[PDB]
Paper text:
Here, we characterize a two-component DRT9 system, composed of a reverse transcriptase (RT) and a non-coding RNA (ncRNA), which exhibits a protein-primed DNA synthesis activity upon phage infection. DRT9 system from Escherichia coli includes a 499 amino acids DRT9-RT protein and a 188 nucleotides ncRNA. DRT9-RT protein comprises five domains, including an N-terminal extension (NTE, residues 1–64) domain, a fingers domain (residues 65–159 and 176–211), a palm domain (residues 160–175 and 212–315), a thumb domain (residues 316–371 and 394–436) and a C-terminal extension (CTE, residues 372–393 and 437–499) domain. Structural analyses revealed that substrate-free DRT9 assembles as a dimer-of-dimers (tetrameric assembly), which undergoes an oligomeric reorganization into a trimer-of-dimers (hexameric assembly) upon substrate binding.
Residue numbers in the entry:
A (entry chain B): 1 to 494
B (entry chain A): 1 to 499
C (entry chain C): 251 to 300
Write the structure that this text describes.
RNA sequence: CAUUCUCUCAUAGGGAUAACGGUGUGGCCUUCUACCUGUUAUAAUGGGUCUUCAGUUGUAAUUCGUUGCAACUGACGGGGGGGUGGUGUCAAAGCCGUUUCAACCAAGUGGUAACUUACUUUUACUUGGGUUUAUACCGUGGAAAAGCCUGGGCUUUUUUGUU
RNA sequence: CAUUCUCUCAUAGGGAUAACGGUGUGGCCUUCUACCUGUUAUAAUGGGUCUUCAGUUGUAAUUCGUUGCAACUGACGGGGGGGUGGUGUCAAAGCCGUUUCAACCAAGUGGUAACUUACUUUUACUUGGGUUUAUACCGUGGAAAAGCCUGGGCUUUUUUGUU
């Protein structure tokens, strides 16, 4: 029947994708092993290839085995579904402690049961698509969440005094009674077929307690339980956005947020589970940066990888610290770490004004921020000479940053860190007996570093220019006004 | 370059689409002419191949000329857009009298400017798609408008009292100052590129007064002008749905709908123009048989061909009358009209229980009703033998009807009309001198019209069974519950054999 | 005003009128809403006395 | 003025060619597809029957939300006018049955018929997707007659190709 | 147990084969991309420069909605500690300059340091988009050698097909 062929197709595609990912993993490991041997010399460790541990718990977790017997698995699953005796096997569940102090139970289903939950719940979320609230996402890394960060950003700016009330539904989704879920299958004009209903009931029967967390099932079953609360909150006028389990609620009027708080409390009582505000306090006013206190009178809302304010959008502090970590660690790897090893055997020592290690460091920093773009390409796109510009970098995950001062400070930080790292590298090289304090890398003095690096050219193409966040931010602002958030985020779309 | 290539592609696609339609038009006119010659006999009128009138007002309206110079037209248009000296040519405007007081100015642009508008304003409405209200459509026949009718139906079925108010934005879109549009460009986080602003300003300069009523440009500008009204109405808690130059607003509380009236008044004042509610609507309360809250209380609302009540969704009376007219005219044309002519020259007369005209009439009715689906296919889809049943018919335009009584009445009407038409055809045949009363079509007796027709088979296929609305409605209910309104109303998707 | 929900709607009415005229109206210095309560109880606001 | 090709002074113009683009039927291929029965070595062909929903009961499970199977039961083709029998009774209702009239609008209008390349805000769609014989269409180009003019042009028909 | 093929009772099992799937580099096609200048008769190839935003002025259109062109002005690479000078003031804060220290966290900690197959909800991505010489990886297979066992089987390395 068509069902078996559809299963076969989905299972095969999933297995092939995982196999391709593993092959890329091992090839990348080998290439990095070659580079590390050429970098640390004869002190580099050996090449270690690791298979994911859960590939061993059950033979179905292995993509290779699934590709071996995809036909048989599809036939058996189709027969069991049409006999209504299907149950998804136990998912491999790992408990990752949440930073706030909680724990998130991440469940990974087997490839067969992960393919069936991506075929029957990606259709159920299309036919019943218009019956869900506008801002309701599944994982905090989804590409459509950035449409919500825009809305808040557009409101925080316009209504200069916005009341916010962030919430946490983790305990709610974790332990919602299955009967309440099963009572919503025929309301709000949901189109759920008899087969899809059976599959939903099988997946919920496996859990016995509540909705799964990190699965395609999560989004639909979350939009199937909080469909009355959503409608109530819309009817009060307060806007909202649920990322995975958090639920921010914002509106201009105090009364509306006060009523939304009561609506959420009543919904929590109705479901029989407790919903608690994530913020220690309840309502919180996010006013302009300059103003006294009243309820909270805060000026920075976090959301994800952002810090929204009435003035502008900016990168969250933790994300900025991680960017600093990665850049400083790239410099430390390519400049300082090899020299700290007990023996300099098989390491290229800079000489003749050429420092291949410095070139590698700058190139890797560029790939991490720009993605490989040279400044000439970015300027060409900005002027109009170029029709296309590909965005793939750490700045491609923040295509809404309006804060120019933060990028300026971060660029200055990059320059200063490069200068200090080069100074320490020169000191260590001298301590090892190889005195190089008059060459190109070490002649620059923190005010000519950018200029001298820019002038320097390799193979006819500038390969030393110090990367700058501000230029790519200008490019992103231009791109968003020509392609939109969607295209900038997902360049593959054509 | 790129702009030139894109313009070339879009213009050529538009021209080829229009040419394909014209080729099919005269190929369709010829087939119907042949059938007419075999229906009206030797008195049949001669064939006529018309050519759309607006293809002569300007050469650039002609699909057969715009394909000749698509390269040159794209070259010049690109050069003029890069030189900021591009003004779209005058569109052809026709005034269609609205059924109520008023006129609709339908504008048909030239193929080049239509291509440019369909290219630039489809991207502008995609990048800024999340900044527009949920229910906002361009045409009353739009296939995505059923997503709003389902919402109103669900609200009516669930709520206890639903207050509704309908508005008219026809004057709003005909007298809105363009300075307002220009002022509404950089707010609400709209991503309008510099050249996409130039083209908007050029298209608005061409009009000088207001938004073109019908075109790809219409919807984006309608959503761009009425972006504060949508935000305010959303903030109050009253839902809305615009579709074409109209606005329904429904809410559970009278105070909220009154505040919606006040918000529309303020917005109309700000724009400098008037938004008048339809003069026979006020606020309609579709209560659940409860207290009327001292407001005009009705039980049926009319919305884009549907009659929405608190218990069922049915076909509007006007649409039912149109369906009845079409079926009755099919029967009259295929059974009665050929006989009323002054001479029966070269017309096939019933013989040996065979009535080719009756078979043609029943098959045409089946195509209009179902789309050619035989009852066996529909029952196979219902049982489960098959998984595909294309919905191509009049009932494909009403995939939300829950009313079973209306469909039963319509089926009985079809049966009665078929019986009466066959009786009149027999009378006329006798008057002409041919007594076919004994023949098969003229002995059915009405009660056995549906019974004896189903048993009869032609070419080993049941081609006489009288089509029924109820069976296809059952099939549509199952198809909806298994595929969604989008797929039922949009029967191409990717393709068949999609596994 | 006697209700916080009402004075909060006064900042929103001056914020919209300020944008309608196209000029800014800022709260004097950094005073903010001041609750001159009779010591009955506080309501999530800076309770002053003078 | 090829709707073909080509060139350029490129939303316009010039040059070259007679073909360019589509339609119905049939065939082929790929689609999933209950049950019976004719003609044959198991294939084609012909014919025939079924497919739905609601409720109850029984029955095996269930995470008590619900599901599976069986047995049935019920539903599953409008309205109007003129007659007309029965049934109803403060008396009338009311109900049911029977007969007759119609193309629909018309369960209507002061009054009624016509119409589909039509009519109407939008009243919008057509056989499940690709190939391959015969039929044939729009506008073109030729060829032969036919009537207007001139003494080549214009005009009609047919034919040819497109095929 | 090839991640290859194939069969079946089919989410498990059976049989057969040595090959299956990927990576970096270059090449071949695509892809629009300014200006000058080396290098051989307009081609290749070496080198160099420029591209941004805001505001003002002039000027052109002008739908008064704006736009175009030209000129000019301004912005266009962090923070901290120690030392030091100038400027401020009733003294000071304050401002400007200069020198030195620190790989980042660190604008910190009691205290520093280390780490990228790492860390962490969600830390995510790697050069628009297609082919194919030489290099080479995942798990397989086969040989040789080398250790164990037996008296071939097992283990290790190299090599080979893969390629
Ligand atoms: Mg909704
Ligand atoms: Mg919105
Ligand atoms: Mg009548
Ligand atoms: Mg430090």
């Amino acid at each position: 029947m068509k069902l078996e062929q559809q299963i076969q197709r989905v299972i095969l595609e999933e297995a092939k994708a995982l196999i391709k990912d593993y092959h890329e993993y091992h090839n990348r490991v080998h290439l990095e092993s070659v580079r590390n041997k050429k970098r640390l010399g004869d002190s580099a460790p050996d090449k270690k290839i690791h298979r994911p541990n859960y590939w061993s718990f059950d033979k179905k977790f292995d993509p290779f085995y699934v590709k071996s017997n995809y036909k048989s698995i599809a036939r058996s699953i189709a027969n069991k579904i049409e006999n209504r005796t299907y149950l998804p096997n136990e998912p491999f569940t790992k408990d990752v402690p949440k930073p706030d102090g909680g724990i998130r139970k991440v469940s990974i289903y087997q490839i067969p049961d992960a393919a069936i939950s991506k075929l029957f719940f990606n259709r159920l979320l299309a036919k019943n698509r218009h019956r869900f609230s506008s801002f309701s996402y599944a994982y905090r890394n989804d590409r459509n969440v950035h449409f919500a960060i825009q809305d808040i950003s557009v409101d925080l700016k316009k209504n200069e005094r916005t009341f916010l009330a962030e919430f946490d539904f983790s305990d709610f989704f974790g332990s919602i009674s299955h009967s309440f879920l099963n009572e919503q299958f025929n309301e709000n004009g949901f189109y759920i077929s008899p087969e899809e209903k059976f599959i939903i009931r099988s997946f919920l029967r496996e859990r016995k307690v509540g909705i799964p967390q990190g699965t395609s099932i999560s989004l639909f079953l979350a939009n199937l339980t909080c469909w009355k609360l959503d409608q109530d909150l819309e009817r009060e006028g307060v806007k909202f956005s649920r990322y995975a389990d958090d639920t921010i609620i914002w509106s201009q009027e105090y009364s509306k947020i006060c009523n939304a708080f009561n609506i959420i409390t009543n919904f929590s009582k109705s479901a029989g589970i407790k919903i608690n505000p994530k913020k220690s306090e309840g309502i919180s006013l996010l006013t302009k940066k300059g103003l006294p206190s009243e309820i909270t009178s805060k000026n920075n809302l976090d959301f994800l990888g952002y810090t929204l304010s009435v003035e502008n959008v900016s990168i969250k502090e933790k994300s900025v610290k991680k960017i600093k970590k990665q850049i400083s660690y790239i410099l430390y790897r390519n400049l300082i770490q090899p020299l700290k090893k007990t023996s300099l055997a098989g390491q290229t020592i800079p000489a003749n004004d050429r420092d291949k290690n410095f070139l590698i460091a700058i190139c890797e920093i560029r790939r991490y921020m720009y993605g490989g773009l040279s400044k000439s390409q970015i300027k060409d796109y900005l002027s109009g000479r170029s029709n296309r510009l590909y965005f793939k970098g750490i700045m491609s995950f923040y295509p809404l940053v309006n804060d120019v001062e933060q990028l300026k400070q971060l660029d200055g930080w990059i320059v200063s860190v490069i200068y200090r790292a080069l100074k320490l590298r020169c000191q260590l090289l001298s301590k090892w007996g190889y005195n190089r304090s008059h060459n190109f890398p070490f002649i620059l003095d923190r005010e000519d570093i950018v200029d001298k690096c820019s002038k320097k050219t390799i193979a006819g193409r500038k390969l030393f220019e110090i990367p700058s966040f501000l230029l790519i931010h200008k490019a992103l602002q231009k791109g968003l006004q020509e392609s939109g958030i969607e295209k900038i985020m997902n360049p593959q779309s054509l």
